Design a protein around this motif. Structure first.
Motif, PDB file in Angstrom:
ATOM      1  N   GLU A 219      -3.695   3.789  -6.329  1.00  0.00           N
ATOM      2  CA  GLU A 219      -3.276   4.844  -5.420  1.00  0.00           C
ATOM      3  C   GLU A 219      -2.258   5.774  -6.098  1.00  0.00           C
TER       4      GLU A 219
ATOM      5  N   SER B 122      -2.784  -6.587  -4.196  1.00  0.00           N
ATOM      6  CA  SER B 122      -2.415  -5.393  -3.451  1.00  0.00           C
ATOM      7  C   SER B 122      -1.629  -4.397  -4.297  1.00  0.00           C
TER       8      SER B 122
ATOM      9  N   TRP C 210      -7.162  -3.402   0.275  1.00  0.00           N
ATOM     10  CA  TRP C 210      -5.968  -3.839  -0.436  1.00  0.00           C
ATOM     11  C   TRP C 210      -5.940  -5.351  -0.620  1.00  0.00           C
TER      12      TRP C 210
ATOM     13  N   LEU D 212      -2.233  -0.521  -5.093  1.00  0.00           N
ATOM     14  CA  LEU D 212      -1.191   0.498  -4.979  1.00  0.00           C
ATOM     15  C   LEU D 212      -1.071   1.287  -6.284  1.00  0.00           C
TER      16      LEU D 212
ATOM     17  N   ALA E  77       0.883  -1.163   0.000  1.00  0.00           N
ATOM     18  CA  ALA E  77       0.000   0.000   0.000  1.00  0.00           C
ATOM     19  C   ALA E  77       0.920   1.212   0.000  1.00  0.00           C
TER      20      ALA E  77
END
Ligand SMILES: CN(C)/C=C\C(=O)c1ccc2[nH]c3ncc(-c4ccc(N5CCN(C)CC5)cc4)cc3c2c1
Length: 275
Positions: A197, A190, A171, A194, A135
């Motif tokens: 993100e 995950s 996540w 990310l 993350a």
């Protein structure tokens, strides 16, 4: 791995300079360092964890994973000494570095962060380590500017192995949050989140969904839409990381290959970020 390889640094050689985040301090041993502290008011489990974290980090040797300088565990409070990452966490960095009309970052910068973390994840996978909490909050940057290198920083969740409401479910793939199953393909999922993100410039995943709604959404086949202005080739990597069945998700060698192709496409890297 033995405590034997853990370099014990005499506490008298260590000075705290400032706090960084709630804890981690900047330190000196004149070697500048991040100092992760174990609370003196800590459970018995917390202590063994702390030692576990140091062993774990100390066994890795990769440019995209933070270095362990040593430990000071024979004195209280207990310290792990880690590579100092001046750029801070990637999530704060993306938020603070969002282009604003009174204004930095380009698509190639985002792709290089993604590549760096994928390279770190590929190393973990080929060494059979499951991070379990990839993350943006757990990634760090050497510095804010164009020479920056992203590294995986926080090896606490892997070391735990808490409650339901503390799981980073936004996540996690379905087999992780439904069955508690963790594999290399968990970290692939995950990594997909990310990426979102990164390309959203530090938004929280599943904006305006709660954990329980995400759980229901994801279980039903629901996936995030592309971040604003996200190139198609990048979104395609995300949707492959989020294949429902783990065996349909790419390994990190494939992910790295696909990220590298993105960095070679002028139509990807010439895309402007939203302001
Ligand atoms: C966050 N995290 C991932 C926590 C636990 C770790 O495992 C870990 C391991 C090694 C580390 N090395 C570091 N070197 C610098 C920092 C740092 C530097 C600057 C800041 N800032 C600037 C602006 N920002 C918005 C507010 C403060 C924050 C953190 C963190 C680590 C670090 C963490």
């Amino acid at each position: 791995s033995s405590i034997s390889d853990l370099k014990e640094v005499p506490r008298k050689n260590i000075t705290l300079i400032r706090g960084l985040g709630h804890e981690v301090y900047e330190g000196q041993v004149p070697l500048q360092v991040a100092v992760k502290t174990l609370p003196e008011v800590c459970s018995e489990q917390d202590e063994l964890d702390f030692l576990m974290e140091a062993l774990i980090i100390s066994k890795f040797n990769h440019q995209n994973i933070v270095r362990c300088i040593g430990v000071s565990l024979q004195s209280l409070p207990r310290f792990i000494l880690l590579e100092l990452m001046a750029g801070g966490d990637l999530k704060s960095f993306l938020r603070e570095t969002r282009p604003r009309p009174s204004q930095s970052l380009a698509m190639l910068d985002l792709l290089h962060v993604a590549r760096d973390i994928a390279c770190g994840c590929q190393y973990l996978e080929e060494n059979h380590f499951i991070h379990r909490d990839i993350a943006a909050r757990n990634c760090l940057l050497t510095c804010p500017g164009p020479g920056r290198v992203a590294k995986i920083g926080d090896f606490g969740m892997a070391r735990d192995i808490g409650g339901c409401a503390m799981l980073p479910v936004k996540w996690m793939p379905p087999e992780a949050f439904m069955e508690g199953i963790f594999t290399s393909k968990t970290d692939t999922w995950s990594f997909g989140v990310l990426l979102w993100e990164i390309f959203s410039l530090g938004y929280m995943p599943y904006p305006s969904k709660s954990n329980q709604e995400v759980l229901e959404f994801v279980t039903s086949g629901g996936r995030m839409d592309p971040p604003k202005n996200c190139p198609g080739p990048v979104y395609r990597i995300m949707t492959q990381c989020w294949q429902h069945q783990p065996e349909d998700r790419p390994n990190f060698a494939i992910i790295l290959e696909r990220i590298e192709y993105c960095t070679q496409d002028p139509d990807v890297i010439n895309t402007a970020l939203p302001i």
